Amino acid sequence: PRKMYSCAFETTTKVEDCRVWAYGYMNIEDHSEYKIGNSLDEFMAWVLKVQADLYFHNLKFAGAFIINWLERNGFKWSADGLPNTYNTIISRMGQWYMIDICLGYKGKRKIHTVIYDSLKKLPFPVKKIAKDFKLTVLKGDIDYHKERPVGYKITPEEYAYIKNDIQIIAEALLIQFKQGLDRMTAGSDSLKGFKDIITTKKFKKVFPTLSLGLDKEVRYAYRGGFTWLNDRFKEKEIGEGMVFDVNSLYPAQMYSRLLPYGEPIVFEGKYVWDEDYPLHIQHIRCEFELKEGYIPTIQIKRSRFYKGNEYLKSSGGEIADLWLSNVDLELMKEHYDLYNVEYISGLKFKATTGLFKDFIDKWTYIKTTSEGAIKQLAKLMLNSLYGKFASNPDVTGKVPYLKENGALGFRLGEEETKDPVYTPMGVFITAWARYTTITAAQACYDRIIYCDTDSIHLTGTEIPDVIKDIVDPKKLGYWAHESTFKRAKYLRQKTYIQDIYMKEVDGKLVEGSPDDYTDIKFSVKCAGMTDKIKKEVTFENFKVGFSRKMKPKPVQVPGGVVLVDDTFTIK
């Protein structure tokens, strides 16, 4: 039985002198067992003797300073566990998942101490986890720009802050660990809770593993949410309008849409209706023109010769080679006119609508009859399951080494292959979800402004008649009227601002309407903006260009990493 601890480092800001000036660790299953020093060598010695599992919230940060030490202390990265060797799992994108420090072997059992990332399990800021889990959290933050030489003495205040940080993460991790949720990520915790309910044996027969070629083609039909801005509104300031959000978009699809399963069946040319294999993916070649008065829906995989992340109005003289789920193809045919079509090949699948019902009823129930921590975790169980299917085959990531500077550095590693869960289920879930949003936006075409996965934004304050019957504040799969604004401005996908109508309900500010409001909440949404950068934004300064050097970014220096106030610009 390996132990588990919540750990955190408080680091220096000096680009020259970067080091741990305070550390802390807390036994997760025993918060009385804890320590808070000020010496990394002190910490690291312990890290080597414990033979347990550690968890730093946002390993990415703390993981740096950890590598720095290992490299300068008889440790070097190694493929497969070796005495005084250390392996790691860092994705090709810079996401840390595990640092496995090996010390040797006792007969067989590897003597090691694995360091994990809590963020991969509780994907939120500590401050947030505190609030949503209702965990005591001290207000304020340790003075970061205070000169701290080596050996500096930690004050009673800074002490409380550090203990508090690791206790918050400990109280959270413990709840999941108290339910089998002992995986590396939330996703895997969901895949776990999901197998418990249907049985691994049933899972194996339902979601068989596919060949590498078969999976490659199925992925050709995979795509994310539907994010799109109507040009008619691009960069213009508009008046009143409203926002609608689907109640649990994915869970909803998983609960009642016809979803694939089983062994696929290849076919040539155009798919032929088959009752036992209702869903399919068609490899098709054609040209197309967006029907007059319809929203674009075709996105050709980024970086080839078609504006990446943009929905095409037409193929523009060039032939398109696409792999589409039948849900995606039915949609394309209603919004576009297709010419010179060629149906090449495809895959049929058996399908049912009862695969996730038990899973979803269970966790929804808990979510409904629970509060604070339990509730959030339940939502986490419910919202992290879909993604696990749309696996990412190639686990090829970075590899560390001491860079010519005394700082941390990386480069590309060998080529490794992980086995696909069941990608066809991923293709249809996201497809079904897009269909949900897109058909609603299209029915509101005359007022549609912006769409983003599970929400549509319309001009006007009155609920559209075509939408009325599927509008409801709580029901799963329904559209909830989330807000109404007095005015707004959209610049680009996920980049806008609104003046929302707020009212008073029992003592707090809540979304209101034109006929009942007392305030106007200014609201900004832009990929990468902060609470600080936001305070400087307003209607007339919000435009393509707006920039400020207020977005700190990881700049690895000798010893670990530092956050330099860099530049942020709306492009």
Place this chain on the structure above:
DNA sequence: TTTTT
């Protein structure tokens, strides 16, 4: 509005 100091 990835989340860390």
